[PDB]
């Protein structure tokens, strides 16, 4: 279990607080009384790692033309895009492979 330093909002006693697991975020920080409240990431948001964000990260990757969802927006990861079946990635552009071609690589004649 990871941990983080924090000073209390009521009366500022510096206490070591509990990190929130992937899928969650610090909804309320730990007190001298209670531990850290981890709330679940809301729709279209994620936390992939043990964190102490007070707000989940937004799924901010949209798939373009010549592109499909390689990975959906989960509460534990961002959305990811690969090229469509007709195309392969190169320099940032998803482009065609000329048969007489995997989303990662150009297959040859």
């Amino acid at each position: 279990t990871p941990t983080y330093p924090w000073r209390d909002a009521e009366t500022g006693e510096r206490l070591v607080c509990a990190q929130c697991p992937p899928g969650t975020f610090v909804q309320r920080p730990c007190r001298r009384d209670s531990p850290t409240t981890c709330g679940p990431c809301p729709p279209r948001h994620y936390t992939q790692f043990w964190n102490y964000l007070e707000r989940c990260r937004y799924c901010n990757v949209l798939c373009g033309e010549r592109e499909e969802e390689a990975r959906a927006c989960h509460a534990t990861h961002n959305r990811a895009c690969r090229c469509r079946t007709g195309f392969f990635a190169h320099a940032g552009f998803c482009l065609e492979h000329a048969s007489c071609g995997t989303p990662s690589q150009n297959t040859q004649c």
Binding site: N60, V61, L62, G92, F93, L95
Partner: protein, 144 residues
């Protein structure tokens, strides 16, 4: 405090009404890096000016072509006159190059605006706008 908005790109819903016309862009206004505060409202492609004063206004639109030129215009709309005002233009002729190019166009300046004014961003070709991520195409304004 002071009216501020930073807006980020979304997928563009390709409109049919464009009689040799530069369409406006749709923006995100609350998710990720996008925010609006202190009465600076985003509705329906416009940013509504709540308070008269001097504003710094900026936008970047990243273009990708997979077209003679590419253009961004930031436009002021008022009810007091039927035609808009072009505040800023960034226009770039597109080199023959290779038909697999990408380019940003960045604009930012200071303008005296009036309560009730609507600011919008227009592009030469909506299908060339890169909408894939919020850090590449954005639009913002703040009262100085």
């Amino acid at each position: 405090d002071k009216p501020r908005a930073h807006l980020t790109v979304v997928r563009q819903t390709p409109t049919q009404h464009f009689k040799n016309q530069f369409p406006a862009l749709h923006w995100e206004h609350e998710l990720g890096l996008a925010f609006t505060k202190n009465r600076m409202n985003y509705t329906n492609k416009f940013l509504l000016i709540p308070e008269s004063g001097d504003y710094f206004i900026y936008s970047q639109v990243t273009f990708r072509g997979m077209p003679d030129s590419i253009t961004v215009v930031i436009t002021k709309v008022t009810d007091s006159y039927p035609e808009p005002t072009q505040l800023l233009m960034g226009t770039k002729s597109v080199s023959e190059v290779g038909s697999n190019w990408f380019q940003p166009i960045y604009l930012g300046a200071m303008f005296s605006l009036q309560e009730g004014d609507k600011l919008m961003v227009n592009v030469s070709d909506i299908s060339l706008v890169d909408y894939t991520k919020e850090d590449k195409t954005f639009f913002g304004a703040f009262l100085l």
